[PDB]
């Protein structure tokens, strides 16, 4: 018998325990093997009232393996230690966004 | 293949590498030899939403050499180490302002 403490618990996939390197790439493999476009985004602060996250280098239109989508975030580990890095997944056609998960936190 | 990091990059002449002492005086020599009035301005913070920069001693109406416009900023180096010093260039007649470049930064 207990309450919930006061954390930020950022957007989505954030009340579950923080997703490890297997669960990062399995969701990245869900992006490409379902035909979505794995884009990487970063931002200074991760509240969901700052509405735009700044897009890392490209949204990776021709990304086919998780070993290179994560390897673009490997180029984004050392670049931004203090930014909430995030791999989003855009729909290829129908104008929507699906996956959203922070891969790196300050 | 790389993105642009998040800096302030203040107003104008600010995405190029910061202008050195030769490029300060060559732009100051562009102010007087084109008949503009070299005024010196300073401010605490250099965002371009604080609209007025505080004018240093005079706008130097009869300034004829770059060795003395810079020598008024030499009197403004030690005065204000923490203010964004700036030599602006006002039009002599037609009510406009042209040159704008930070010569000293905190």
């Amino acid at each position: 018998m207990q309450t919930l403490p006061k954390e930020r618990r950022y957007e989505t996939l954030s009340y579950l325990p923080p997703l490890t390197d297997v669960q990062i790439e399995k969701q990245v493999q869900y992006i490409l093997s379902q035909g979505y476009i794995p884009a990487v985004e970063f931002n200074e602060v991760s509240e969901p009232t700052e509405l735009y996250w700044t897009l890392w280098k490209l949204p990776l239109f021709g990304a086919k393996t998780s070993r290179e989508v994560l390897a673009e975030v490997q180029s984004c580990r050392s670049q931004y230690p203090g930014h909430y890095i995030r791999v989003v997944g855009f729909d290829n056609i129908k104008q929507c966004q699906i996956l959203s998960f922070i891969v790196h936190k300050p | 293949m790389q993105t642009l990091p998040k800096e302030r990059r203040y107003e104008t002449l600010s995405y190029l590498p910061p202008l050195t002492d030769v490029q300060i005086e060559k732009q100051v020599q562009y102010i007087l030899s084109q008949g503009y009035i070299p005024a010196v301005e300073f401010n605490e913070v250099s965002e371009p939403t604080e609209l007025y920069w505080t004018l240093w001693k005079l706008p130097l109406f009869g300034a004829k050499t770059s060795r003395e416009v810079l020598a008024e900023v030499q009197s403004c180096r030690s005065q204000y180490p923490g203010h964004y010093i700036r030599v602006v260039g006002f039009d002599n007649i037609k009510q406009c302002q042209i040159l704008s470049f930070i010569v000293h930064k905190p």
Binding site: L4, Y15, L19, Q27 | -
Partner: protein, 430 residues
């Protein structure tokens, strides 16, 4: 008569088709009642403006009942008025005496007549962009107890649900304003419970502030006040307040950026009988053409394969752009919505923690999941009861974003999330 039954009339792409479910009186033949359900819904200058029947299609598995497809012309009806579709079509036709029970099953608003309407204020895509809530079905408490809670103690129960990761929190049907709780003070102490629950957990929290009012002047001054509390969403009981007040508020919510949660209050007077009334897939089309960014579509969990085929039938009608004519799923006409915005499908029955694997598979991303409907609360309160319904949500979205078949590996992903969540593990059984 019998000039209103034209069975060779291949209906035009600009007609407004209507598929009744006629149960005629004994002795009434099927051609004569189908010409009569097309009769008194028109012209009780007649060859161009006539509601005419063009197909019979008797109900399989049952005698003395058929599905009379009526083909109303376009220029009979008002541009932009869904209270003129229901005045014209179902106005004086259900009371016709040679019909034991007449039920409007489905209706086809064409591309020509959908463009006169507004659609929802904000679709699925525009709503989720405003809320910044992507890739998961949203959430909701309904504040129990309904009545009695003073405007702050109501707001304290809103703050307590919205702390625990709950996206939205519904205001009740019968809470508009009442001498224990006025709307001006309910809306104040709720918008003061949202700006604390949105500052605590940074997500855009909202509350479906009930703006259903006696007059349309008291409804817009009840919505112009939820606008000036900077509230993301309001709600409106669209069948007690009607399609003139809803379309008034539709046009307002588009023109003031407020999302609209259409509640289907009093929907079951007019559809819950399977032989007489207006089936909800007509009323779901009717409020997609008036406004609503949400609509209650009830629940799927307490329903059989046919009763959730029909329930998923109108969920696609109010959410997908093009829906093919699939009569076993209930949709009687191929409906092209002509890029009209979608409406959410809000699941609100007796659903609880363990129905999250089903209702992320059945209802997709584009859904809202209400709670507290029939279930006996949560033994630790609201803020654990909402964190249970949010961890069990996102445990099912995590497994769905990893390919795990949530029909069979769904009860596993609740039980392996009860380990890494203590508020979930006590709602894991009751």
């Amino acid at each position: 008569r019998l000039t209103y039954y034209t069975p060779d009339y291949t209906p035009k792409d600009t007609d407004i088709l209507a598929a009744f479910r006629v149960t005629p009186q004994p002795g009434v033949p099927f051609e004569e009642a189908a010409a009569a359900v097309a009769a008194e819904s028109s012209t009780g200058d007649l060859d161009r403006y006539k509601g005419r029947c063009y197909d019979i299609e008797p109900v399989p598995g049952e005698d003395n009942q058929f599905i009379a497809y009526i083909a109303y012309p376009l220029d009979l009806f008002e541009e932009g008025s869904i209270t003129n579709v229901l005045t014209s079509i179902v106005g004086n036709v259900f009371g016709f005496k040679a019909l034991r029970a007449l039920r409007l099953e489905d209706i086809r608003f064409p591309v020509a007549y959908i463009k006169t309407f507004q659609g929802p204020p904000h679709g699925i895509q525009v709503e989720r962009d405003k809320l910044n809530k992507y890739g998961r079905p949203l959430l909701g408490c309904t504040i129990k107890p309904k009545l009695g809670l003073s405007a702050k103690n109501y707001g304290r129960a809103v703050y307590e649900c919205l702390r625990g990761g709950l996206d939205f929190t519904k205001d009740d049907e019968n809470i508009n304003s009442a001498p224990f709780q006025r709307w001006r003070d309910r809306f104040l102490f709720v918008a003061d419970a949202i700006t604390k629950a949105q500052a605590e957990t940074g997500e855009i929290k909202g509350h479906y502030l009930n703006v259903t009012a006696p007059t349309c002047e008291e409804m817009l001054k009840r919505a112009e006040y939820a606008k000036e509390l900077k509230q993301p969403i309001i709600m409106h009981d669209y069948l007690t307040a009607g399609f003139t007040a809803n379309t008034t508020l539709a046009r307002w919510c588009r023109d003031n950026g407020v999302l609209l949660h259409i509640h289907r209050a009093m929907h079951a007077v007019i559809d819950r009988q399977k032989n007489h009334g207006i089936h909800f897939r007509v009323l779901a089309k009717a409020l997609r053409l008036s406004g609503g960014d949400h609509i209650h579509t009830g629940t799927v969990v307490g329903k059989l394969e046919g009763e959730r085929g029909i329930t998923m039938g109108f969920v696609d009608l109010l959410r997908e752009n093009y829906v093919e004519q699939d009569k076993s799923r209930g949709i009687y006409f191929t409906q092209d919505w002509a890029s009209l915005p979608g409406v959410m499908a809000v699941a609100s029955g007796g659903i609880h923690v363990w129905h999250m694997p089903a209702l992320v598979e059945i209802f997709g991303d584009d859904s809202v999941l209400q709670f507290g409907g029939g279930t006996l609360g949560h033994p630790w309160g609201n803020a654990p009861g909402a964190t249970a319904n949010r961890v069990a949500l996102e445990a099912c979205v995590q497994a769905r974003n990893e390919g795990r078949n949530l029909a069979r590996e769904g009860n596993d992903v609740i039980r392996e999330a009860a380990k890494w969540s203590p508020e979930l593990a006590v709602a894991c059984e009751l």
